[PDB]
Each structure stands twice: as C-alpha cells, then as structure tokens.
C-alpha cells in the first residue's frame, strides 16, 4: 500500500504545516501537524475542556462506529516550546492520503495548553518519531507509520515541505519526480527516539564550506533551524545590523536586509537554504526588526533541523530495520 497527502502552511510565515487526516467511521477529517520529533497522535475532541477549544475541528469518538475506548490508558506530553496536552485514548481507523490503519491509538485531549488553544488551524498532532517516545500509559502505543509499515510497498515516508506553498507527505514510496539529482542517505541513531543524524558541516552564503560534525534531529514539528552558537554567530555576522536580543528571544535583523543562504552538509552532498527562507518577519506587527530563522540551540540540548532546513530538501525517513535518512535537492 501507499498514501499521499498534501501538507499546507498554516500561515504566511510557514510557522507549521497541516495535513488532512481521516479518523473514524464515518470519517471525521482533522488537520494535523505531522511531527517527526514526537510520537503521539493526539486530537482536539469532544472531551477537550470547552474553554480550551477556539475554532479547532474536534474528534467525537461517540459518533464513530469503529472507536473503542482503550481502557485505563492515559497520555500526557510536553513539547520543547513549553506547550502540553493530555487526555485519554481510543483506538479507531485512521487514514492519511488513502493509506488506512485500523486500531490506531487516537489520543483524545482533555486538556491543552494555551498555545494550542490559540492556534485555530491545528486540530492535533500526528507523531512520526520512533514509538519508544509515545507517552501512552500504562501500555505504550505505536505511531501511525509504525502500524502501517508492514503493509507499505517500501517501509518509508517522505517529507516535501513547500516554501510559502503546499507540499506533500508520501507513505510507502519515493516519488522520483519530486527531487533533482540523487538522494544522499546518512546514518540515524534511534537512541533518543528521534530521527537523529550528523551533518557534515555548513557554509554561509558564497563562503567556503566548513567541515564539522553537527549532530541533530530532523523535526518537521519545529519551525526553525537550531544550531550551535558558533555556527549561528557565523551566519548572522554576515547580516548588517543583526544581533541576538535577549528580550525578543533570539537573533533579529533589519527587515530591510537581504539574507545570505545557508548550506548544510549531508555526507558529501550539500543542501542550500535560500536566504528568503530564513526571514520570519517582523517581531511584532509593524516593526522593522525581523526574526531570524536560524537560532542557537545552546539552551535546548540538541540541534534541530526544523522546517527551515527540511523545506529546502526532499527528505526520506527510511524505516527499514536499520533506519536512515535521505536528503535530495529539489
């Protein structure tokens, strides 16, 4: 089997991407944030505290003839941005782009934190990291990819995120028309539950490539590119007027600037992030200070190849017995 679904930016900055997902019988379609940095499929629901729902589409398990309460199961998650959610668990039929999994754990939110409530465009998350990170207790549950893997033509999914434009998530096949050149594969460590890999270095604009190992995670659920402070300082030093602002929470730059590109290494191959992809717009409405898309990871504990980096590439998440990641230009 295969599946193919379009993923669409939630706003003009590409702050996140939503993909339609069918849950239940008859189908209830929710727009979920596919997140290769977490492993819970959770949704706003008929059980979510009413004051914490503000425009999202909800899953109502009582209206699904295939929904079954997973007795005793609860979940609770906190994300790197400080947001969180928790609730109980159903199993139900879940389909993405024509690919169907029966008995998928659908984690129904009873509580969500304010940032979820405030984002009317995201109806929940669909985790695509490794199932060892799934938070369901007392019986940990499998991700949608893990449940579908054995049925897929090839045990892979691909992320093709657009810049200010829709893109595609495919399951079970590699669309050879979707990228240029060849796909370069690189090793993955699953020891932390992430799609964790080692970039071979970077370049700023037309500058020379610096060979240096950068361990980080391929995370479609993080907006920006978070890298070591040395790397980020080298980038922003090429932008007149750029500075790290403690009050804003990162590097800012004059909105009048033209940003240089940033290149990262995948083995001997190179992925080029155009400068425009690094512009996240005014820090507040009407400001001439703009927020940078490359930020320091020093306060995180891990480097994150988020959407800013991934949307410059066609990315293969290879779930073979030994997982690997593949990157191609496009």
UniProtKB/Swiss-Prot annotation:
Decide whether keyword Ribonucleoprotein is in the record: no
What residues form the catalytic site here?
A: 35, 199
Q: Which UniProt keywords apply?
A: Aspartyl protease, Disulfide bond, Hydrolase, Protease, Signal, Zymogen
EC identifiers of the protein: 3.4.23.22
Does the keyword field hold Protease? Answer: yes
Q: Which domain of life is it from?
A: Eukaryota
**GO terms for molecular function, please?**
aspartic-type endopeptidase activity
Peptidase A1 domain location is 17-328
Disulfide cross-links: 255-290
Name one process (GO BP) from the record.
proteolysis
**Which reactions are catalysed by this chain?**
Hydrolysis of proteins with specificity similar to that of pepsin A, prefers hydrophobic residues at P1 and P1', but does not cleave 14-Ala-|-Leu-15 in the B chain of insulin or Z-Glu-Tyr. Clots milk
Stated family: Belongs to the peptidase A1 family.
Supply the name of the protein. Answer: Endothiapepsin
Organism equals Cryphonectria parasitica
Query: Which residues of the parent protein does this chain contain?
Result: 90 to 419 of 419
């Amino acid at each position: 089997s295969t599946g193919s679904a379009t993923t669409t930016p939630i706003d003009s900055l590409d702050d996140a991407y939503i993909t339609p997902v069918q849950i239940g019988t008859p189908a209830q379609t929710l727009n979920l944030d596919f997140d290769t940095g977490s492993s819970d499929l959770w949704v706003f629901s008929s059980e979510t505290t009413a004051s914490e729902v503000d425009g999202q589409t909800i899953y109502t398990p009582s209206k699904s003839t295939t929904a079954k309460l997973l007795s005793g199961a609860t979940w609770s998650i906190s994300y790197g941005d400080g947001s969180s959610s928790s609730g109980d668990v159903y199993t139900d039929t879940v389909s993405v782009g024509g690919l169907t999994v029966t008995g998928q754990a659908v984690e129904s939110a009873k509580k969500v934190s304010s940032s979820f409530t405030e984002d009317s465009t995201i109806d929940g998350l669909l985790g695509l990291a490794f199932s060892t990170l799934n938070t369901v207790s007392p019986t940990q549950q499998k991700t949608f990819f893990d449940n579908a893997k054995a049925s897929l033509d090839s045990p892979v999914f691909t992320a093709d995120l657009g810049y200010h434009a829709p893109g595609t998530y495919n399951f079970g096949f590699i669309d050879t028309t979707a990228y240029t050149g060849s796909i370069t594969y690189t090793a993955v460590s699953t020891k932390q539950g992430f799609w964790e890999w080692t970039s071979t270095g970077y370049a700023v604009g037309s500058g020379t490539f610096k060979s240096t190992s950068i361990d980080g995670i391929a995370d479609t659920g993080t907006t920006l590119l978070y890298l070591p402070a040395t790397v980020v300082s080298a980038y922003w030093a090429q932008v007149s007027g750029a500075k790290s602002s403690s009050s804003v929470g990162g590097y800012v730059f004059p909105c009048s600037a033209t940003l240089p590109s940033f290149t990262f290494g995948v083995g001997s191959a190179r992925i080029v992030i155009p400068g425009d992809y690094i512009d996240f717009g005014p820090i507040s409405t009407g400001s001439s200070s703009c927020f940078g898309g490359i930020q320091s990871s020093a306060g995180i504990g891990i480097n994150i190849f988020g959407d800013v980096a991934l949307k410059a590439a066609f990315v293969v998440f290879n779930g073979a017995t030994t997982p690997t990641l593949g990157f191609a230009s496009k």
